[PDB]
Symmetry: C3
Subunit: 310 residues, 3 copies
């Protein structure tokens, strides 16, 4: 029962700065102590200096390839994350990555599928993060990771991303909590027949059924390893206010956590990313505390924490 808590304080995949503070905030909230308390032999893994990267992002506004903003910087860092996560798994340890915007998952998923190529992927998010380099309207790379992992729009993808291994198929990715999908993404998900459960399915079937369906969609043989990339903005902003791109009509705090327990209960989770926590994007001390403690809550629940006897 060994765990490596991968710190990924990156913010180049999007406009607002502050999300790179996630790792620190989470850790000071007692994340590592919590994993220990859950019986996890933990050790931190730093991939790069958070402030050094902020400097390179704040200045170099010349790092672009079309509407895509900061592709080189995002490629460099996500590659270091990929390599890091890859080793962590080769060592037979569970990698829990703390972001940082969601573009880090390009490194995480790439790293996990490198050791567990048959792993399914549950993308808990309000967004589909599948925009292509050519299609991305905003150009914020945190909304493009999946397109890159899937190898879509191969032609218009640059050199700085050639390091990205092609190991993720459409039938191994399942969304949950979607409600802010771009027209381009709606078509893509439909073209590729990606299993996506929007808030509509949650309202229709309740979180339980959805989770069940989500897990089945990426787990054919019922034995496959499961990975969850958890974007906190999936949860209604009235619970998670400190986040870059909030959208109303999100999961309730109870659903956000129940979802984790169902997964833990699955007994096949091999990795977890907890992203989009931006402390500087709050109004009070409770805005940040509620947000960060929610992050730690997803971690404890995913890692086995239950409300009753265990």
């Amino acid at each position: 029962k060994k765990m490596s808590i991968v710190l990924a304080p990156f913010s180049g995949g999007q406009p607002h700065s502050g999300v790179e503070l996630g790792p620190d905030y989470l850790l000071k909230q007692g994340l590592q102590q919590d994993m220990e308390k859950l019986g996890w032999d933990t050790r931190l893994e730093r991939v790069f200096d958070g402030k050094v990267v902020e400097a390179r992002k704040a200045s170099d506004n010349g790092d672009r390839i079309g509407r895509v903003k900061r592709p080189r910087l995002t490629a460099e860092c996500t590659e270091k994350i990929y390599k890091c996560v890859r080793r962590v798994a080769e060592q037979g340890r569970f990698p829990l990555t703390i972001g940082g915007d969601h573009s880090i998952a390009l490194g995480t998923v790439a790293g996990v599928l490198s050791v567990h190529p048959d792993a399914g992927v549950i993308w808990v998010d309000a967004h589909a993060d599948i925009n292509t380099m050519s299609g991305t309207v905003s150009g914020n790379l945190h909304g493009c990771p999946l397109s890159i992992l899937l190898g879509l729009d191969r032609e218009n993808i640059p050199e700085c991303f050639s390091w990205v291994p092609q190991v993720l198929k459409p039938n191994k990715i399942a969304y949950i909590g979607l409600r802010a999908v771009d027209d381009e993404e709606k078509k893509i998900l439909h073209d590729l027949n990606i299993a996506a459960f929007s808030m509509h399915h949650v309202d229709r079937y309740g979180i339980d059924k959805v989770v069940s369906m989500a897990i089945e969609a990426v787990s054919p043989k019922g034995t496959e390893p499961v990975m969850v990339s958890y974007d906190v903005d999936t949860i209604d902003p009235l619970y998670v206010p400190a986040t870059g791109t909030p959208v109303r009509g999100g999961l309730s705090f109870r659903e956000a956590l129940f979802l984790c327990e169902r997964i833990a209960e699955c007994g096949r989770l091999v990795a977890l990313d907890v992203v989009e926590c931006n402390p500087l994007l709050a109004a009070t001390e409770s805005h940040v505390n509620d947000t960060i403690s929610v992050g730690c809550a997803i971690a404890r629940c995913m890692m086995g924490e239950t409300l009753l006897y265990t």
Copy 2:
């Protein structure tokens, strides 16, 4: 695919002024652009000058018939709405009416049932709005429309309402989200055996089942046209604060919208009223924005807007 957005800035059916501003606010929120974006060939239909009517209401406190307040004024305006909506339907266009307090539905429903006499009616509301002229304690006519449409207490109903055609039967009206019913109304609904789904059924069966049940109750042959008069105060005030008579324990924002999609999904909606939006009844700019954007949201969702590919 033709639509007429009927503007009904009336506030005589109740105490608070400001609800007649609904139409304008909605429209500036981009309501018509939204219907266009949904592929609806739209055109506005003005029934009367909003400020002119406010003047006649503010002054003439002598317009009463018992406890009933402003019956003449309400009759005059709701008649113009009736006629308007009637023509809009005769033209084969979908009428989307924006209020204005709920007393306008006397004109809307009367207008719709004039062209589609077999249309069922789903009343999404926290209130039953079925009080009689004689029974109404408050005297606020926005809580009496259904009694008039149903022809109840025929004897004590005045001359100014003789224009109201009798075309609505008890078996063609179904409530959803009820939680603030008057004793008089509880008896009536029971006497007439009106299908009413209070918050109790939502909590008990969940919004999906309720919607299904609500649609079946007014649609025997499974082919009948469906009309929905949507009172925004059905939604919990923590979502829709700017409304005249809010009651706690309402539908969540997610339920409010999911309900619409289920209906749209029904493929038989022939008309829709979106009422009780009172901008001046807020505390902040978000109170109004949240309320008005919620109004536009019900419109988009009812008219086909989905979270995923369509």
Copy 3:
């Protein structure tokens, strides 16, 4: 149809003062008028002077037996409550007790099971309140009542509690809404196989199923009398802010009340405690009003109040 509204303004079972104001606040909110309106022939029953007891608690910091704080004082008062409730039932009247912290339930449950020894007990709470005298970390007796009623840790229980009759078995107590259980309590509930439904079951099955399950667990023959000790802190603090130990992820206002109706609908409720309302533990006038009116709401709903015709 006779009812005795037992006033129990006690606060010795916990740190914060103000919760003894519950009874008064509730009553001024019209609690008794409400029970009358529901057709209940009511009469108040005062057990002791609320301010006199506050004086004895504020001063005597020497009243302890280990980590347990104020055992003598709690024993004296809960005994008076026991006796009171016992008589109220012997008189064939329904006892509705208003607290006051949850340690009063030692008197209430003891009183009810004295006249209805086969009565099941539904503990609506975020906490299990089953800590032992020896195990209690906090020492706040409001989290120990059930251990005393169950006769657990008999050896380390003091003289001042010998008056407590042993009439409650593990198979006659069922929790609902649990989410803040201590490690000690988790073991106990598991050892004794106590039917406990945490927020996890609510999220998983919805409030309806849970209530059904909760009622079945304590009602084998399907004829047994039912008692509910209702801790308002079971409801999410965003609904019930004025309470001593709030925990996020609670029941929604709708669930809090729906739960009551299901019970009322059961037709076998023989007693009800409504506890933990601390007016002085608010920030605004709405904090207190919302809290206290919620208390009265649970009362009306439990006692038969429905949203539709009855």
